[PDB]
Design a protein around this ligand. Structure first.
Ligand SMILES: Cc1cc2nc3c(=O)[nH]c(=O)nc-3n(C[C@H](O)[C@H](O)[C@H](O)COP(=O)(O)O)c2cc1C
Ligand code: SF4
Ligand code: SF4
Ligand code: SF4
Ligand code: FES
Ligand code: FES
Lengths: 209, 70, 185, 443, 115
């Protein structure tokens, strides 16, 4: 019911079959994450919590690679860091420029954990356009700008698993994933307004605030 | 480092642990005995300093002793 | 640009299915375990598609009610699949493969021949509503790469001459054809 | 012992075998009682001696995956276990159903039966691509033939297994050609994969553990359990084995399809069986071997390499589909790879954050490389951003998108620079008044 | 105890707060977990009124915005009794272990299904 694993000298015993992020956070090692959450089910979507594990060719996603007994785990291999910069670049070069007027100024968790893991030249030209995203109405209680949604899918898992109003489904492929509904119907559920403290970017936000 | 090891071995009663950082040096001294330390180390042959540039203080109100004096 | 658009343009939840379709649907559902029962949703949407072309929000809501599902999961299924055509579509959906072997044997000129025949931009439909264009990617059948498919089936090895003859014929006269010759060698 | 024209006493025969009865004349449904009533462990040992390598794209030894479906805890009441047939083929190049599913399904039915005997599978699902509505009815009636004649279903040639065959339609998603997105499609959800380390052999595939097999690696199963393990091990390499199917297309002399020896010269393959190159051997510019997702061999190191897996893996090319596309020298490789970029744009699912923005950025770059708007350093910038997607996805679709451009920087760049020579002032002086100005990419 | 260098009558009058800074729920990231905070309350009549000319908020608390950043709660409280004013400590609240099989995507006979 306990297992030692070694994350970078920090040996730590946690419960069997658990989450590797839970081992990292028990070991006091800060691991950047966007689509992990505590009280939601794990999705592998955000692809940020990559960590190097012995006897594995690729840096696996620490949100979902289960605890194997006696692992050697590195968060500081240059493959890890100079892949995290890679993944953050490939999360940001389709994000809009709303940073002064996006609501989560000092709380865009993307923006907060960008500088210490990121890369300056998001490569573009005046020829290149990113993509646009249709704003959608979820209710007069929640202001919504879906241009900023980095598809963390924390909202969907929250509306399904904890809320029980499954009306915020995902849609589309490629660039064209939109979250919400394309029936354009308003969510009117209880504890809906938790989601604006939950989408880590300011795509969902508070309407009277 | 080696200079700090010399100062450590030369006056082991009155000194505490040295601390080296990025081309400068900081000697930790027990506070009841500073005057015999600074009769030395200002005024040794091998340590001919003779010129002081700052005495001041820093609080960190964390610990039970409160004001380190630098 | 696979879009996820509104539901205003006279598709506002008013439709159903028909008589043999429900029996055939029960036959389909019987291929799946009784509890944990959703997996007939994609062929049931095909049955709705062949019943009512341009599968609207209404038949999707009817399926979601029918298979005990919350609706957004059904929308989340039918948001993927390019089979599930949403906008009203003509009698013969014309799917030109423009993938790499089809490119390298001249389907580019085939699309040129079609747009010369039917002056339609390749994401639109004819004003006659006889044909609806769609460039499509590889249907696997790289056998005779200038092929296309039309609404059910594949027409191998098309010259632009054979293509415009097919566009003349499929106005009225059906062409149950793999290709002009028989075999694959 | 060189490799040959595969010696017509072979596995499959499309021409005179589409029948219940003519399949039995071919040698199908011929020793089925002995096979089912022999142990599944015997099937494990025979297919492991066979050295059968998985034709899906992994190149995986099939006996290891099939034994990997069998743990010791299997005999505990963990629920009805079954099997999934990846009958979708969605890569460019693979015509490996029109030969197989359209023209020889009665191999495939008892192939599923023998494989499910090896799994102790309660039933089996066959996941056809629902684009093949022509083929789907043909296969479904062919299954219903043996299903109504008692050959399959609850007494399948005197079987102690009740075993059912259900057909299911793949609705226009190459991503559903990946196994785990296939499982989530068979859960009736969206075609979005799951993350790997809960392995599909025990996680619950549609709730209970299963496996996913290629249609061609299960089509050979009853023939290779009626023949010996040394029959398939007689060919190819010491580790690669047997015959595999080739779909040869692109700008060639005669576009065609065969089923031939592994480890053959590609030049003999083109010249002896498909006419040759349209323009001859001195008129190719590159060859796309195997998958759509494989780097391109150049004209000199396509001459004498092999047509295996492992040696071509040493020439950076994992021929996981064995579908060869050959190009004239008078055509644009740039347009081909740009079309693959648009292909992955239509076929990226959406779960992976890097895959979507990756494929979009790659498409935006390859349009510049067609039109010649780039700068000389942007080639290596493109290579770096392809390396960004090289190992950082859930499923290997992103890696599959990363292979052709990594093949583009390899063996090439006279022609990137030659197209980029065709004007000056890259990233040109424009204004963007209400839309952009002075140039544009595709719309 | 007499205060040596505290000219106010803070030491008899106000309630101060020792608290672990809460884990923010909006961002993920936990740097506020690793401090200890001293904060004077606003239980006041002064308590930040409204100005009438421009309309700032001119306070009357001479020590409205002030935070120590300590290391340990007992070092915090030994300081708090050493300089000697009335405190109240507040215990933090952790997040409890819950085993997360990423494979939680499997059922028996059961009505409800999820994404
Ligand atoms: C993105 C991706 C797409 C794939 N598409 C197909 C396909 O369309 N047809 C196929 O037979 N295998 C496809 N495969 C390979 C499957 O995983 C295949 O079922 C697997 O290799 C089974 O191994 P096998 O050949 O031993 O059966 C794909 C794999 C990946 C990663
Ligand atoms: S979420 Fe908003 S505030 Fe944060 S980086 Fe993105 S645009 Fe800026
Ligand atoms: S709604 Fe918000 S939390 Fe959910 S995926 Fe979109 S941006 Fe993320
Ligand atoms: S590689 Fe990732 S984004 Fe692409 S289809 Fe697979 S899971 Fe989706
Ligand atoms: S949550 Fe761990 S990678 Fe997305
Ligand atoms: S080549 Fe386009 S369909 Fe196979």
């Amino acid at each position: 019911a306990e297992i030692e694993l070694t994350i970078d000298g920090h040996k730590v015993s946690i419960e069997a079959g658990s989450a590797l992020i839970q081992a990292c956070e028990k070991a006091g090692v800060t691991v950047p994450r966007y689509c992990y959450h505590d009280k939601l089910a794990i999705a592998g979507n955000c692809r940020m919590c990559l960590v190097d594990v012995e006897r594995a060719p690729k840096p696996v996603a620490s949100c979902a690679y289960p605890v194997a007994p006696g692992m050697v785990v590195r968060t500081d291999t240059e493959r890890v860091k100079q892949a995290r910069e890679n993944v953050m670049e490939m999360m940001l070069q389709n994000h809009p420029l709303d940073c002064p007027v996006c609501d989560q100024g000092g709380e865009c968790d993307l923006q907060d954990q960008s500088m210490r893991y990121g890369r300056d030249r998001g490569r573009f030209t005046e020829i290149t356009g990113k993509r646009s995203t249709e704003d959608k109405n979820i209710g007069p209680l929640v202001k919504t700008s879906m241009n900023r949604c980095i598809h963390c899918t924390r909202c969907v898992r929250f509306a399904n698993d904890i809320a029980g109003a499954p009306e915020l489904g995902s849609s589309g492929r490629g660039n064209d994933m939109q979250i919400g509904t394309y029936l354009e119907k308003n969510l009117n559920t209880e504890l809906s307004g938790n989601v604006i403290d939950l989408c880590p970017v300011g795509a969902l936000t508070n309407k009277p605030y | 480092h080696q200079y700090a090891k010399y100062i450590m071995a030369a006056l082991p009663k009155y000194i505490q642990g040295f601390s080296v950082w990025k081309d400068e040096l900081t000697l930790h001294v027990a506070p009841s005995a500073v005057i015999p330390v600074t009769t030395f180390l200002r005024d040794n042959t091998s340590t001919q300093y003779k010129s002081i540039i700052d005495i001041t203080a820093v609080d960190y109100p964390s610990r039970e002793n409160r004001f380190e004096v630098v | 640009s696979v879009h996820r658009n509104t539901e205003n343009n006279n598709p506002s939840i008013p439709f159903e299915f028909s008589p043999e379709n429900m029996k055939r649907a029960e036959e389909v559902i019987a291929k799946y375990p009784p509890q944990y029962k959703k997996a007939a949703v994609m062929p049931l949407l095909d049955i709705g598609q062949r019943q009512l072309g341009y599968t609207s929000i209404s038949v999707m809501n009817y399926v979601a009610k029918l298979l005990e599902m919350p609706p957004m999961r059904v929308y989340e299924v039918a948001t993927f699949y390019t089979m599930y055509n949403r906008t009203p579509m003509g009698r013969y959906h014309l799917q030109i493969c423009t993938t790499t072997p089809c490119q390298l044997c001249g389907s580019d000129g085939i699309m040129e021949a079609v747009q010369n025949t039917l002056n339609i931009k390749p994401g639109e439909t004819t004003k006659d509503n006889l044909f609806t264009l769609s460039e499509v990617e590889c249907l696997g059948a790289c056998v005779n790469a200038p092929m296309m498919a039309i609404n059910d089936d594949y027409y191998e090895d098309l010259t632009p001459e054979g293509t415009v003859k097919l566009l003349e014929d499929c106005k009225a006269g059906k062409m149950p054809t793999p290709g002009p010759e028989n075999h694959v060698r | 012992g060189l490799k040959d024209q595969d010696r017509i006493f072979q596995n499959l025969y499309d021409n005179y075998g589409w029948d219940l009865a003519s399949a039995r004349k071919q040698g199908d449904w011929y020793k089925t009682k002995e096979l089912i009533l022999k142990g599944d462990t015997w099937i494990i040992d025979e297919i492991k001696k066979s050295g059968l390598r998985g034709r899906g794209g992994a190149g995986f030894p099939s006996g290891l995956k099939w034994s990997f479906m069998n743990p010791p805890g299997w005999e505990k009441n963990e629920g009805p276990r079954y099997l999934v047939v990846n009958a979708d083929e969605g890569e460019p190049g693979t015509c490996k159903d029109r030969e197989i599913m359209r023209k020889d399904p009665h191999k495939l039915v008892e192939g599923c039966l023998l494989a499910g005997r090896a799994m102790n599978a309660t039933a089996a699902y066959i996941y056809i691509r629902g684009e093949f509505y022509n083929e789907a009815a043909v296969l479904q009636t062919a299954i219903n033939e043996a299903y109504a004649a008692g050959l399959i279903g609850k007494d399948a040639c005197g079987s102690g297994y009740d075993f059912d065959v259900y057909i299911h339609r793949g609705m226009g998603a190459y991503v559903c050609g990946e196994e785990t997105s296939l499982i989530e499609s068979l859960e009736g959800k969206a075609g979005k994969p799951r993350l790997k380390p809960p392995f599909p052999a025990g996680v619950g595939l549609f709730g209970r553990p299963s496996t996913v097999t290629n249609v061609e690696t299960v089509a050979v199963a009853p023939t290779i359990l009626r023949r010996g393990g040394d029959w398939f091990a007689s060919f190819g390499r010491e580790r690669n084995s047997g015959t595999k199917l080739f779909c040869i297309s692109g700008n060639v002399n005669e576009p065609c399809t065969v089923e031939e020896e592994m480890s053959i010269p590609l030049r003999e393959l083109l010249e002896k069986h498909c006419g040759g190159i349209k323009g001859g051997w001195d008129n190719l510019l590159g060859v796309i071997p195997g998958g759509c997702s494989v780097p391109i061999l150049p004209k000199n190191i396509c001459e004498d390499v092999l047509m295996d897996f492992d040696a071509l893996k040493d020439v950076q090319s994992g021929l996981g589909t064995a579908a060869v596309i050959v190009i004239n020298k008078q055509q644009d490789v740039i347009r081909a790879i740009q079309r693959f970029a648009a292909f992955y744009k239509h076929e990226s699912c959406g779960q992976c954050t890097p895959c979507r923005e990756g494929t979009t950025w790659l498409l935006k770059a390859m349009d510049r490389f067609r039109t010649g708007q780039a700068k000389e350093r942007e080639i290596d910038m493109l290579y770096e951003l392809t390396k960004d997607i090289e190992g950082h996805t859930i499923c290997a679709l992103g890696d599959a998108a990363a292979w052709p451009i990594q093949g583009l920087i390899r063996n090439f760049r006279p022609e990137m620079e030659t197209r980029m020579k065709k004007f000056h002032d890259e990233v040109g002086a424009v204004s963007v008044g209400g839309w952009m100005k002075d140039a544009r990419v595709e719309k | 105890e007499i205060v040596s260098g505290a000219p106010a009558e803070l030491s008899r009058n106000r309630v101060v707060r020792i608290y672990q800074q809460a884990k923010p729920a909006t961002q993920s990231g936990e740097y506020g977990t690793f401090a200890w905070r001293l904060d004077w309350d606003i239980v006041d009549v002064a308590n930040r009124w409204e100005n009438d000319l421009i309309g700032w908020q001119s306070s009357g608390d001479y020590m409205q915005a002030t935070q120590m950043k300590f290391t340990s709660k007992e070092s915090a409280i030994k300081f708090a009794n050493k300089q000697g004013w009335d405190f109240y400590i507040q215990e933090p609240h952790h997040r409890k272990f819950r085993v997360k099989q990423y494979a939680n995507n499997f059922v028996h006979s059961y009505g409800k299904l999820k994404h």
